[PDB]
Design a protein around this ligand. Sequence first.
Ligand code: ICS
Ligand code: CLF
Ligand code: CLF
Ligand SMILES: [Fe+3]
Ligand SMILES: [Fe+3]
Lengths: 522, 522, 473, 472
Amino acid sequence: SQQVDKIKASYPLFLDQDYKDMLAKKRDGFEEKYPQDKIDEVFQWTTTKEYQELNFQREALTVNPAKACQPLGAVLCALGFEKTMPYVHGSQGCVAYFRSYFNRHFREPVSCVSDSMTEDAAVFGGQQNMKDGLQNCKATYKPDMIAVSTTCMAEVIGDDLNAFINNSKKEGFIPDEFPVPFAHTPAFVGSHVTGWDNMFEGIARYFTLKSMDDKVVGSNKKINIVPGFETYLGNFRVIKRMLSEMGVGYSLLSDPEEVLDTPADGQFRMYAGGTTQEEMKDAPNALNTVLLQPWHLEKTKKFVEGTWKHEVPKLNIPMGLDWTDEFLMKVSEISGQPIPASLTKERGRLVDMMTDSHTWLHGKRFALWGDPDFVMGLVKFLLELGCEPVHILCHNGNKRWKKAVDAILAASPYGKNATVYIGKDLWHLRSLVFTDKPDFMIGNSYGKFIQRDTLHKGKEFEVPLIRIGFPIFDRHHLHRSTTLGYEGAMQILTTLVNSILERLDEETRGMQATDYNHDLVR
Amino acid sequence: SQQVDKIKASYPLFLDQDYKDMLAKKRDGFEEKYPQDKIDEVFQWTTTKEYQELNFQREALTVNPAKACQPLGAVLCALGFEKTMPYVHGSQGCVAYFRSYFNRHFREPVSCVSDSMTEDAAVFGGQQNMKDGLQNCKATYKPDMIAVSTTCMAEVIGDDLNAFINNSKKEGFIPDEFPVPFAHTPAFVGSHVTGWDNMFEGIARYFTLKSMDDKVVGSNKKINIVPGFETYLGNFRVIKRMLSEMGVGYSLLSDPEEVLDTPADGQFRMYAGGTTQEEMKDAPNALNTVLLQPWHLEKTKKFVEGTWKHEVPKLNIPMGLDWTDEFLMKVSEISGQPIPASLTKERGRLVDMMTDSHTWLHGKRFALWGDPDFVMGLVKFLLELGCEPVHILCHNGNKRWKKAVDAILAASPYGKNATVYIGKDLWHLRSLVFTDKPDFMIGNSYGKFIQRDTLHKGKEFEVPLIRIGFPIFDRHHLHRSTTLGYEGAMQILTTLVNSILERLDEETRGMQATDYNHDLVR
Amino acid sequence: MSREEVESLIQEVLEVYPEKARKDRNKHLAVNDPSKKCIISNKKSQPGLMTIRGCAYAGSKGVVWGPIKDMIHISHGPVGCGQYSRAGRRNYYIGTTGVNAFVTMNFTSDFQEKDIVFGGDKKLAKLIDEVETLFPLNKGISVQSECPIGLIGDDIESVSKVKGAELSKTIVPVRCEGFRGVSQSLGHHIANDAVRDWVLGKRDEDTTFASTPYDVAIIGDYNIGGDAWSSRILLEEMGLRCVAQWSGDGSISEIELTPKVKLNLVHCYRSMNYISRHMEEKYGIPWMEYNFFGPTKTIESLRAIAAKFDESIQKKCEEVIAKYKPEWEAVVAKYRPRLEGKRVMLYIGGLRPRHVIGAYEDLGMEVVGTGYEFAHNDDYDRTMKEMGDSTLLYDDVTGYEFEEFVKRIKPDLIGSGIKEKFIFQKMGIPFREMHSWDYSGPYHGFDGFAIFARDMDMTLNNPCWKKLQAPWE
Amino acid sequence: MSREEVESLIQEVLEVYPEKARKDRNKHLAVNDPKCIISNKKSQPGLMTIRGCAYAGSKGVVWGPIKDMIHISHGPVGCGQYSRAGRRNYYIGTTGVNAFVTMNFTSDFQEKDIVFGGDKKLAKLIDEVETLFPLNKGISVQSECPIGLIGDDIESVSKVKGAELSKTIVPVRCEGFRGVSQSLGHHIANDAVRDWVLGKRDEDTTFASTPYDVAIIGDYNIGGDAWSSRILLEEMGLRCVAQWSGDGSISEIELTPKVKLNLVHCYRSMNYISRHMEEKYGIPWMEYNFFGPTKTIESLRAIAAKFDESIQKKCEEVIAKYKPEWEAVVAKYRPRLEGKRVMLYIGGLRPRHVIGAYEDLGMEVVGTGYEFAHNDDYDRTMKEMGDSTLLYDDVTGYEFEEFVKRIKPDLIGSGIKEKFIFQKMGIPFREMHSWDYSGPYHGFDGFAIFARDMDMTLNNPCWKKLQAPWEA
Ligand code: ICS
Ligand code: CLF
Ligand code: CLF
Ligand SMILES: [Fe+3]
Ligand SMILES: [Fe+3]
């Protein structure tokens, strides 16, 4: 039954009595449901420490992963170049998923094609699909460049991308000068961030390898900035903003900021901005190249250092107070430009905010997860605020990274109760927050089901989630936020402190029970 | 009983059994408290419509007002001028409160002095306090200027500020050319926004009234911007940001942006930035003057139009899509500068966020309060988003403002169930959200006790608060936000939609009960 | 507007294609006129034309098997497939996720290179053991094959038979590798046959289930936002007893009990007609198609279902229609005057492009164009009847074609999926998601129609669409 | 800390003043030696004093915390608004029904109330309070500035309306212009309790007394400070009949004439009504201090001596029970705070009452001072403070900054109008008014919190980050 006065959607429609009894008869009649008291006893068991021990013995099963597959990152890297179509050689289902995943996070169009390799290509190779695919894409969507990656199908059958593209140019399917860089992006290796590294390194060598004789380091007096797999629009913009304030010439290679944020003005724009091909050809002439996320750019680093002959500085991600300083000081040293007064003040303002909020941040225990560079910067910043990163999880982290983070924790008293996990997933984390309860989680939208599980155990065990990461599906426009630089530090601080305060307000709202602490001024 | 490794502050310390029993024995034996069954019956009575009718028949008692007194706004206006010391002629207890009130909202130093008028001054006037006060201030804190307002004590005994200041310079307590603007700011007239109006009108008079002989409108090719009583730092910044992008010469008269956001760099700065006296003296040479909050700048408009001979355009506060548009177009017409593609894009991206989120905003019912100009822009923006401002409350609103707002409501189908209240307080609003329950409240930190009262009746009756306005005491750094222009609209939009979604997540987090609607994607 | 324009528009769009794709695409676009008659479907996608189609793994894991709640479904292969599809479709269910239900969870074997070289069967058996220690209340396991499973010579059936007999548990191997077929379509068929060969026959010699002349099963209703719950209430208010729902909120036992019902109500023909035809051959159970979109189709479908029984069920059917009559009439009275005459374009999967037209017309709207991602020729035969003359029809439309068609026709509303929503919102065209119901719904039944009408109104008549152009160009 | 240094510092700070204020400020700055300072004098105009007014001392301090009474801010809208929920006098109750502490009741004076008087409005107001809050147990009328200057007569209204409704209406003439500080607000408020509420039960004989009955006087329950103290005395065997006024009721206060002992925590704010009850009811009163373990141990025993040997035995039980707790607090936090110097500036009690708690953590108080203390308050401070420590009365903002610049203390304890000044300078800061939204600090349970709070702030990592690594 519906009142046209107040229409009810699924919630709370199915709480009406007539729907409630029906679902009860459906359960009792045909579902062969386990007794509720069994379900409770089992749920309790899944929160215990014995279950955690079993949970951490898993070798073959992965439950609720915290990572994606390579081509996802290759698509995102390719969208950052001017008027280029990301092109995924393989089966079409991947592309349908790649666009959907990004549509939901950015709430924007995400253009990407496939050459729809099918049953036949699995036995004869996908060379024909590559020929007609490149010709079809180029004539239909008129891009100036086509960046090719692979699905795991195309990798298993061993399709040689280099030959397939070359024979497409030899036979006249695309012009011989039309830019078509490529990268093998196997889904069974690494994660989505490796796909970003592989794609960018492949695009780099396409414009750089057979032209180094005319290049001299520093002649264009600029600094190359490689952002890596980045899904916050503010992070691209805060890098460019600070570099413009310093008067530093820069090239942000892979800049998807415009295409992921086109205006709604009665016209669809498939392409927008991005790094031009001219900047990519001139990048070897830069003073140096900075890697904002070096822990998943190692392939690119070795190419930049080896072929461009750029002395890539050893810099952590510009997240937090110290690492934003070292970043600005390195950029100053390379470019010769002094750090302007506007950034000195901004740093101080972030410091002022830490002083006004340290009483509520001190001692708070956080579980967190995400990609390697993002996780270690968040760990570093948490320590700078006096917080305890109790459970640190990075599904796609390596052991060299874990030792780097373990040394960051050892260099601070607030990392004493901290442990770093690698190769584990959110089902592992679900146990850690039950048996070693933190105060909050910091992660992507998938952590919402962990908070739902903690609350089922009881209100006093609920661990609220703080949505900082990728993907964020159940909130709107958080992708516009910033996490890099001082500006990103201020937003995160604000998000942390106020999430703590909103939880206190909720716990102390009980009239004549806990509201004695429901202070107006906090 | 405290456990050294887990020390409990007030909450949850007083939940322990020995405290709960001791508080129960205090009540039963000494407090002679009413029986809970009675106070439960009374609380329920206070949520009925019968109680609301008695509540709204008040005329002598005010409960939880949503306004302050004039001098509070005069101090904030004065803080916006370069090296200016706010100075309020009267009793000192007011300055203790004015500074404390602003300290807690901005979490910054707030410098303001009194001349400490006592029983002796009440029966003989405060002339002597003014002479010693001004002199003690000028030598001790070395301000370039001292802006004098009044406490309600000094207004009742009829102190003549103009004479007292002139006598102070006559007798050599302060130099004769030392700028000492003054305004009468009686607390029993209007509210804090009126104190802002009176103070700015007085400072403009001191610097322009005698120098009109050589002023020609438009000679400096600038536009004057009067912000009014403004407590968001981003609102000053965003106005100067858009005007800078338009290449429009502008003069922001009263700019406390620097003083209210000084960096923590090992030294305390009493003064910082602000409008210079040179800009105030040259203000009459501007092409025109724009009033960002015209509904409490009545006096300033009369002076600007009567003495500077500027045609102050009829512009609403630049809040929301339509009014930010009219604001830029008016500035474009006056200055001759075109609206640059940067602002055309930014508007587009705001529109894109509206289309992306409209499905969650549509039909959502809001109660809200605050100052007249801020409230009318919020109502305007809410209608543009498809929301229904059911209860609109402005304690310090006047009758012609209510008619203006009622006209905006009638021009949109989403204002069909709206009612504008003036002269009512947040105890009137408490009844309204009980008898005509909206979905959320948009107001200051005083609304947290209305959410606390709605929750006591029942979880399905709780009305969560969305903190936009002044003062905000129980959250940190929200004073850095923006509510003006497209940027402000984007933050308000994000705040609203994500407030709706986190409430939906909370209501559908029950396992096997409502979590079927605990969607990952929203 | 009509005939020579729409057909000149179709050749207008196609002039930009290379000849090979142009010739193939020409046959997938057509104009209506109420026997392949005018359009082919279920063919290969042209490479590099930005298809909206998914794979066969999406059609089997994300569509048919995923919604089964008391089973654990494993994405066998690399980590990509199960992750992008985790909780992507709103097929609702009642249960305790992680204890006795697992729909929104993502179980995977997460293939590393070591398993591409050595095969992944030994790991899969080891995975099944870990699943059983950690999720003891699961009532079955399905193994959804991703692309590499077939290309490396793995045999998931032997692992399923050995581990299934060892643990005395139903373990369903599904060879739904993404490269098979041309779309999600074959995924359904592969999944249907996997239900047949491994689940459906488990209780053929069991006789303990007490049947009744009114036993009935809902086939092809995946409970998007409670869609199947909005349909069940109407059928059980009619006196019927619904023994199973496939697969929305469905259980393993509801599937095994389906061979005992008297009638199979097929909502989604394209994805479930395979198992329906088999259940009529093996068990003699007849199956009919029905439509619960809008009051017109729902009332028509309710009466058609009642005719298959006795006069009592027919007399309850008219008591149900009368009880909801004031409700849906108030819905029409309030919202039709706001949506009358507005033209809508649709592009969805395999059923809804035709099944919702009746609901739109009940609100006085007109579908000037529709089309399917992956439908077959018999789907387009049913579509011919449901739409007017001179209306546009497109099969496996390309991103370019869709955009071009919307620019010329200027429909007032578009209904499609997430990969199209933000394209047309920037173009100023109101848009409703017709897969996820834009996180609203349900849209089935009478209670769903109220939501449907409210949802079409709030979007079409939202004020945000008036503000797309700046008042200064 | 050389003592010719501090005396020369006091000197070369006052050279900025004009002579009139320099001469008066010179008498408000002194270095001690355990008769050299004057206080409770007029604030010099225009020097940014931290002082409040007599309305703050009466409404915001003494009366406000009384939870079942409705306190009316009589006058313009400002005073009640800036003080609404400003200080954390905690209470148990149902706000808006039977309790009203955090609510703001005001008469919102307009121009026609200033010219015509506001006594007709005050009488109609009291009616509106009675209809909309029937469970209130008394009304107090706190006068803001204009009430006394326009010749209003709140008492005649209070006496007329009091008899008409058979309800106790307390007229308080605490206009902010009276006195020099919040201090006179206390006194005016004390005299208003004495004359309008305290004698209510002089006739009554129905309260069953007890030789161990006591009442706490001058603990306003900042963050539960009174609750954290009451627990310690009730476990000692005593009976606390009343808490003035933290989480206090009118009935509790009315029954205070029936105790055997009055334990005053805050002397400066409650000594007035303490002496009156010794004169009128013979009830003795004694000072004590529940800040830190040393002063709490010392106080518990001193209080026990006023009774028999049962209590003195129950006493030593209490001391032994919490002995492992506070000793664990010290072992954990003293090595983190040892040897660090604190500068204080608070109101009228805590500038000397918390000295013992800082010493139990190994810290030293190189300077302290009061906003509004009298000379008898400084007499007690001479004993608690060490040699050659700086003392200041009604310190100006300029003085307070210059003192800290030279002395360079490791942590400053003051109020909200100073916190963000010294934080930007790089000196840790703890609010000693609101406990910086922490607490309680009274008793043993409070000492744990107190110690954790001084440590989290002083040794917070944010303090070593004030200097940009490229400005060095
Ligand atoms: S199953 Fe099919 S694409 Fe019949 S794969 Fe697809 S929940 Fe569509 S038009 Mo998404 S044949 Fe269902 C469908 Fe229709 S996922 Fe849903 S909306 S009625
Ligand atoms: S068509 Fe379909 S979705 Fe594509 S892979 Fe194949 S089953 Fe899967 Fe999976 S893992 Fe990442 S998304 Fe692919 S490339 Fe390998
Ligand atoms: S010393 Fe006097 S009683 Fe004390 S706090 Fe000051 S008025 Fe009040 Fe003032 S803040 Fe505004 S100007 Fe008047 S109402 Fe109130
Ligand atoms: Fe968008
Ligand atoms: Fe600050």
